[PDB]
Design a protein around this ligand. Structure first.
Ligand code: PLP
Ligand code: PLP
Lengths: 457, 457
């Protein structure tokens, strides 16, 4: 009966991030997912696929967790929804807020504000940064600095923070007031620079840009500890220490975008502790619930919270609120997700098997003639494909090497993403992954990379 | 142990729309909701309150629907989540998309795009309006016109559309490019104008503003059929016909913001059919799931969809996507919600009992010395309090008459909202409301209004 559903799909469902015409015509074939379990999903044809991307870096505890379904259900029966306006709460949202601060967030974090998506979380961050400066009497200190290849969402303001051109095309972005310093990708550094030199370059370029704009006009700097969607750029050694020194010098807030990195993905609690970042504000989503329900959390530091608190005395309640902020079933899902992360120590398993997977990818693909670089950290890994490795020359985009390798992986029964704006194969498997399953993943990638190299080299 | 939960609440939970200091100090006392059923919620002290506001205009099928919990649970077990990127779907999201278009949306609607909140839905609308114009080669046609007292969300861009100052304070809003024409509130019209004259005034003011800005720079006009949060402003007879004529003359898209009005609230399928609106784009959330799970839907008309579809051929896939777009458990919740709305004909009940409630409040409050106007439509109603009715003179805001009446209602065990920026008591009860329950609501309001009158007058 799937033919009828696909007719309806093409007629009426506008998908995110999907070629509108090819989808409506049938040229881009649809795929219905009917179930899932462990690290595998099942499609409408009965195929069982290894999901080496955990949905979108988000199904961290793995698929098919009926424990989380039970928790969601229980809360849905008891109280599916009430608002959290004007001091209203559930037990679940209170408990979740204290657990995030006490067990997961870095030191000196104080409060949590809830939305539904990473994008609305970063939208909240922009509102908060402005508010902070206005109530401290600095109405000019408003600009946000992001980075090239950063992903921070798909809205107008959040799309502007995003430093990938597809999220800007025909939307008139980035808006004035948001700027982009350099992507800290060492492999693509100015030729001849060593790691320490490149760090200095990145710091100097940021300093330069702050000064060019005027430090009294620059409010915040936003960054992922490890860049995910852009894809899987690990920062060079000393990058975050060097950047923070510049930010302290000019009194610029650090927003850590931990939507991908939080809740165990890198083998640490969050990327911020792992890289010695000391952010003033933190964005989370994805691994917060392992996607069992939609939820985002903005974690607010002492510095910013204290200013917001004092200001309310003279300025009244801050005018910010989503109807579904603190949604009970979503909170309940998060609590169950956290219970599982803690009980099975999936943070530890991510460090263990992530190191193993990364090292196995390194052995098997360093020196391979299609591959320009192997990178990764914890349970994130990527192969970037280049026409000329030492020259840092990419393939012609129209050759579609990344997408071809991904497609070959999918024919062998594995999902691994062709990352955007480059020829990059990304891995972000569930944190329950075993060594055996990692070996299988690497085997399938080997075959797919060999096959595509045979066709294009 | 609720004392410990409130200690944790104050320490760690940043609520939406809540005085930060008063909340943290304890001056604004917290409230935990533990259960709910029909039209009543239960707090942490065992108090049972009549919720005459259905959460926030959103719990339309009523509280305690274990049918929806069952549907959520079933989907959580089967497949809680996969993405809907690149043509991927579930059965539920496909079914929901065809049911919205076929059974609920007005004629000539084609596609549905999903988010999680009303705000992110309207953010999608802005992105879509820009895209449309850019790919038609009109890069100047970008400005959006909203209205004074419109509520369209709590983001930066969506906060700008919002025409209530609290959503702008210390956020530097509205952003350049968004403008606000007049609030179509007849009772507050220029003195001496009759209904038909006021309609003409509103049309002329809009024409004026389009011309002042330059019609080739104006892309869209956004409006709620009936203004909710602003609060409960029913448009004058002929307003929407007159406004649409102006919009057609200058080729300006109509965005109907149906977050409140959709799915039965006004006694029609949506407000747009009810008021003869023919929008190009529609925003929905709230009543789409009755808040049992977070979901928003942008409904895209044929005109706009066809342009988007053609454009993808030369321009490639549109760069828009939320990770949780089309979230399966949320879709499943919507389907169950729709099943209930249709089965118990809650649209009809909303028309019946809503007319009864509105009339029953007109009888009891028209002529009452505290009340300047009684207004409403379907299951929306409001009492606006004035110092001088015939003069249209409001009370001193510092007298807090609206909030006082609301507080008195809450002591008698009923929740009814003190609407912002005015002295207004709003009603938006679940659509399952009976005549008997409406009488009870009116009784409690009478007592509370009498008490506050014999106290301020
Ligand atoms: C993946 C990611 C998001 C995703 O946001 P959604 O609105 O949930 O799509 C947001 N911010 C950052 C930094 C990310 O890495
Ligand atoms: C109530 C309303 C919203 C609410 O948005 P959330 O983000 O769900 O709180 C948004 N837009 C409009 C037009 C509304 O009337």
């Amino acid at each position: 009966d799937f033919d009828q559903l696909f007719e309806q799909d093409r007629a009426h469902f506008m998908h995110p991030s999907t070629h509108a015409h090819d989808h409506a015509s049938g040229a881009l074939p649809g795929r219905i997912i009917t179930g899932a379990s462990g690290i595998r999903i099942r499609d409408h044809e009965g195929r069982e696929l290894i999901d080496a991307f955990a949905g979108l870096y988000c199904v961290n505890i793995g698929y098919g967790r009926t424990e989380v379904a039970d928790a969601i259900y229980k809360q849905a029966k008891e109280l599916a929804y009430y608002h959290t306006y004007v001091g209203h709460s559930t037990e679940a949202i209170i408990e979740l807020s204290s657990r995030i601060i006490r067990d997961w967030a870095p030191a000196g974090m104080k409060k949590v504000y809830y939305g539904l998506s990473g994008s609305d979380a970063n939208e909240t961050q922009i509102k908060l940064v402005r508010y902070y400066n206005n109530v401290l009497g600095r109405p000019q200190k408003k600009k946000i600095i992001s980075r090239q290849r950063g992903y921070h969402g798909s809205g107008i303001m959040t799309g502007s923070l995003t430093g990938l051109p597809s999220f800007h095309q025909h939307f008139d972005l980035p808006v004035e007031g948001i700027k982009h310093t350099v992507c800290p990708h060492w492999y693509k550094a100015p030729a001849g620079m060593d790691e320490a030199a490149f760090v200095r370059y990145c710091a100097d370029e940021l300093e330069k840009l702050i000064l060019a704009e005027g430090p009294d006009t620059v409010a915040a700097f936003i960054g992922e500890p490890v860049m995910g969607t852009g894809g899987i750029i690990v920062p060079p050694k000393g990058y975050w220490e060097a950047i923070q020194a510049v930010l302290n010098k000019y009194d610029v807030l650090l927003i850590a975008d931990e939507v991908v990195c939080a809740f165990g993905r890198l083998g640490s609690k969050m990327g911020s502790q792992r890289y010695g970042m000391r952010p003033d504000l933190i964005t989370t989503a994805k691994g917060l619930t392992s996607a069992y329900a939609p939820l985002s959390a903005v974690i607010v530091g002492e510095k910013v919270w204290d200013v917001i608190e004092k200001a309310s005395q003279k300025e009244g309640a801050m005018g910010h609120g989503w109807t579904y902020s603190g949604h009970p079933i979503c909170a309940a899902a998060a609590l169950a997700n956290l219970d599982i992360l803690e009980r099975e120590n999936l943070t530890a398993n991510a460090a263990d098997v992530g190191a193993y997977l990364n090292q196995r990818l390194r052995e098997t693909f360093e020196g391979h003639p299609l591959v320009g670089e192997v990178r990764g950290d914890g349970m994130l890994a990527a192969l970037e494909f280049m026409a000329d490795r030492e020259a840092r020359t990419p393939f012609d985009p129209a050759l579609k090497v990344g997408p071809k390798v991904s497609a070959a992986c999918l024919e062998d029964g594995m999902i691994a993403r062709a990352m955007p704006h480059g020829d990059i194969l990304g891995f972000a498997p569930p944190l329950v992954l075993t060594r055996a399953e990692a070996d299988e993943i690497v085997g399938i990638a080997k075959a797919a990379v060999d096959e595509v190299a045979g066709e294009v080299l």
